[PDB]
Amino acid sequence: DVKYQIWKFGVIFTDNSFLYLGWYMVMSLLGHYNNFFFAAHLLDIAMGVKTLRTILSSVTHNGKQLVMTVGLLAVVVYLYTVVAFNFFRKFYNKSEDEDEPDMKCDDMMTCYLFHMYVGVRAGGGIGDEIEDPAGDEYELYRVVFDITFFFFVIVILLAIIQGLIIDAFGELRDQQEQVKEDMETKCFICGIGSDYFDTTPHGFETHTLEEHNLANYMFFLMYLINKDETEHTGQESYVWKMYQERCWDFFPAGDCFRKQYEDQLS
Amino acid sequence: PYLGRIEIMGASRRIERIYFEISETNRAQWEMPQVKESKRQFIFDVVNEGGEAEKMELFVSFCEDTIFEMQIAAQISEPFWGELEVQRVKFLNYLSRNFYTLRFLALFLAFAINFILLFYKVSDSPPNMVYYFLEESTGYMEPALWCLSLLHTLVAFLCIIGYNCLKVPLVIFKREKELARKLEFDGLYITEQPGDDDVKGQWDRLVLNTPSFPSNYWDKFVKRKVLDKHGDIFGRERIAELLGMDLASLDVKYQIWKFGVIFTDNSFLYLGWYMVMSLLGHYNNFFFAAHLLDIAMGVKTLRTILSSVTHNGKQLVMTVGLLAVVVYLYTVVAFNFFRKFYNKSEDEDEPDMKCDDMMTCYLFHMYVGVRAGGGIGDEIEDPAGDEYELYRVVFDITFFFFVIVILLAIIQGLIIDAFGELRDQQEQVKEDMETKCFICGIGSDYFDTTPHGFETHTLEEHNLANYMFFLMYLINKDETEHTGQESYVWKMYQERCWDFFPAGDCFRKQYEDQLS
Numbered sequence A: 001d002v003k004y005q006i007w008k009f010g011v012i013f014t015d016n017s018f019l020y021l022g023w024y025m026v027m028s029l030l031g032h033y034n035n036f037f038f039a040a041h042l043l044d045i046a047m048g049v050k051t052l053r054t055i056l057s058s059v060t061h062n063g064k065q066l067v068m069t070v071g072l073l074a075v076v077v078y079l080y081t082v083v084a085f086n087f088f089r090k091f092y093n094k095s096e097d098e099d100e101p102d103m104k105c106d107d108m109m110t111c112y113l114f115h116m117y118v119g120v121r122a123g124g125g126i127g128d129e130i131e132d133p134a135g136d137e138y139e140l141y142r143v144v145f146d147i148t149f150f151f152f153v154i155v156i157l158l159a160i161i162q163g164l165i166i167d168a169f170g171e172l173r174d175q176q177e178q179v180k181e182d183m184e185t186k187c188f189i190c191g192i193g194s195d196y197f198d199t200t201p202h203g204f205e206t207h208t209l210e211e212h213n214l215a216n217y218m219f220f221l222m223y224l225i226n227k228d229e230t231e232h233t234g235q236e237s238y239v240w241k242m243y244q245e246r247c248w249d250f251f252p253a254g255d256c257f258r259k260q261y262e263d264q265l266s
Numbered sequence B: 001p002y003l004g005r006i007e008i009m010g011a012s013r014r015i016e017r018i019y020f021e022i023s024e025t026n027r028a029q030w031e032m033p034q035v036k037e038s039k040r041q042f043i044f045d046v047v048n049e050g051g052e053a054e055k056m057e058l059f060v061s062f063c064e065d066t067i068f069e070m071q072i073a074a075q076i077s078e079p080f081w082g083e084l085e086v087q088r089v090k091f092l093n094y095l096s097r098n099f100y101t102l103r104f105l106a107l108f109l110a111f112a113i114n115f116i117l118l119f120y121k122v123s124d125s126p127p128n129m130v131y132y133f134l135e136e137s138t139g140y141m142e143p144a145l146w147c148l149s150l151l152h153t154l155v156a157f158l159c160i161i162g163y164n165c166l167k168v169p170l171v172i173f174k175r176e177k178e179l180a181r182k183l184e185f186d187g188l189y190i191t192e193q194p195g196d197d198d199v200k201g202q203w204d205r206l207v208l209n210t211p212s213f214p215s216n217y218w219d220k221f222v223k224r225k226v227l228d229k230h231g232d233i234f235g236r237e238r239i240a241e242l243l244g245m246d247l248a249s250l251d252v253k254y255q256i257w258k259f260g261v262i263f264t265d266n267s268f269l270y271l272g273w274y275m276v277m278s279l280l281g282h283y284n285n286f287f288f289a290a291h292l293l294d295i296a297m298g299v300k301t302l303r304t305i306l307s308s309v310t311h312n313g314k315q316l317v318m319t320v321g322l323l324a325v326v327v328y329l330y331t332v333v334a335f336n337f338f339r340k341f342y343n344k345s346e347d348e349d350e351p352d353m354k355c356d357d358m359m360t361c362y363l364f365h366m367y368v369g370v371r372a373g374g375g376i377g378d379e380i381e382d383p384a385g386d387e388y389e390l391y392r393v394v395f396d397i398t399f400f401f402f403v404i405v406i407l408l409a410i411i412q413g414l415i416i417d418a419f420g421e422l423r424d425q426q427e428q429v430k431e432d433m434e435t436k437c438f439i440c441g442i443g444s445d446y447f448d449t450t451p452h453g454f455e456t457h458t459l460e461e462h463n464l465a466n467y468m469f470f471l472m473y474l475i476n477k478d479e480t481e482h483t484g485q486e487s488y489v490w491k492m493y494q495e496r497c498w499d500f501f502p503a504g505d506c507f508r509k510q511y512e513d514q515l516s
């Protein structure tokens, strides 16, 4: 079937894992051309090691927020660049030579590039990086500029990323705790709380290992699929018909054998 | 489909079910995404900062606001004096319906103008006052900038007009409704007479005698109701002269009051500031670079991230003041003992001591000591080879710990804690909505006795959407056409008594004996 083969090839080519393996092979081939291409395979540890994958998920959890805050940092640095370009052209000079001074804020693009390059990567704002403001009429304006840069651009806008990562670690930990506690406290299939089952000793364990085991439900489903039709019992035919009609009423919800027949079981 | 179900505490003091008809247009207004967002915000706010006593009050207020919003949406939606009036109202409706698209276009224009301005250059010679010129080889970007600035100012003007024609009615309706409630059920201007500490009350005092006081609020009989309620105490003639009513027969002032209200309105003020800076861009183009911060009010994720830091603005101000105080204390300590070291001049002829003056030493500390990564000792003269070695090393180390590490880690801790508290707020509101019924408060554990019990109860029996639809149905339906239960609920609503809302009870709890 040529059409089916074409469709299958399209599906597998769209598949992400197959695409990743194809890229792995392409870089492996290009290593033969330029050996250093084999140094790009070392990042496969991210997809390989489970703990590394979890740690990287801790930061990719808030990738959208990180992009948003980086855009906010770019916006505020551009605003400070405009503020500097309009008033403080003198100070951004990096050339000691008097014959050919190098002013790094005459051009708007150049001043923005200078800010994005060195002002953020400096530990004390831009005032510590560029010409000293003392002995000038704009002393107060420029010290306010430098201090506001230090607070709003370095402290807060590089602590937001750390807060985002810490919060992501926390939210992941609470997700794991919540799923574990929910599994411990409730029956997955029926939803009845464990407090009822703990009336008798080991009641919840017995219920979840003998009565409402999801593994047992899956085994029953595969048993129905494997067993030839017209060989089903009445209950098996009922469940098979429900499955073919895709109606999940047969799954017990809020009820169980003990709840149904406690009058005779007690 | 178009059938609504509710449960009330009827006159027989038992839970009773009421059926009514829901319109297709109203339903479409309900699943409108703007109304969905408003509902989400209302649920979050009430669950997070609302008690059970006033919860029904807040719910009814939100229902009334939503009803007014859908009425305005239906009004503006569309499926020589007369012709010009028709054209004008059509244009106003178009602006009202496309306010959000115009705002997005304004943001795009701001980004485009800023990007074009990113090719600014300075040249002393014409292309000591410098002649500013924009450098580019293509040649069309200057006319592009001029056209973009004109079109952006136009877009801002249409945005303000659309806001005035769309969202101002909500503010006017809310203010008039609150004034009517405080006049009737509280007698704020009859007995209480606020002690000049409520500027809002003083401003609303003007509109009392206006003829068309209930312009948007539906209850036009507020004057008659308050007169009937407070006659025997105040005086019929004095109530009539206070309210402007023609007792014997039983708007410039209103326009001024409305203008004052809209001018006080924060969103209108922000849009006015946007237009002012857009105009001042024509004077000095770099004023268009101040519109780029509109992304904070524009993008939802940016707004949430900025709320994460504005949550503790008071605490951040307090800790910055504490940092200023401690740096001043260290400045005093240095000024009294360590004047030698704060020298930044290598030249021996003219040494520059930066701690002889108290103001100068404080400025030096606030400027460089905090922004240094290793305290002030790494920034100023080395302490070795001196008698004050121990004192100065203790000074530097205490500065490093108390001023740089702790007092710049407090801000990071505050931001992290704010992120955490916001996350727990969202988790708590979601879990409360999942585990309890909003209207009645009965836990979900009872309803999960039968399969899908809680879902059926919250989608058929106690749906807040159904309650809002019933309330708007009562408002729309003409009086003297109400059924007995409808008249009962209407009377309760007019008396502002929320006993009819089921609290801690439901139809299943009431009649399980026959339902089982």
Ligand SMILES: Nc1ncnc2[nH]cnc12
Pocket: A183, A184, A186, A187, A188, A189, A190, A207, A208, A209, A212, A213, A214, A215
């Ligand atoms: N029904 C169930 N089967 C297996 N593990 C469970 N954990 C909780 N409920 C369970």
Ligand SMILES: Nc1ncnc2[nH]cnc12
Pocket: B433, B434, B436, B437, B438, B439, B440, B457, B458, B459, B462, B463, B464, B465
């Ligand atoms: N009564 C109710 N209506 C709609 N959503 C709900 N979530 C919880 N209770 C609800």
Ligand SMILES: [Zn+2]
Pocket: A187, A188, A189, A190, A191, A192, A207, A212, A256
């Ligand atoms: Zn179970």
Ligand SMILES: [Zn+2]
Pocket: B437, B438, B439, B440, B441, B442, B457, B462, B506
């Ligand atoms: Zn309920």
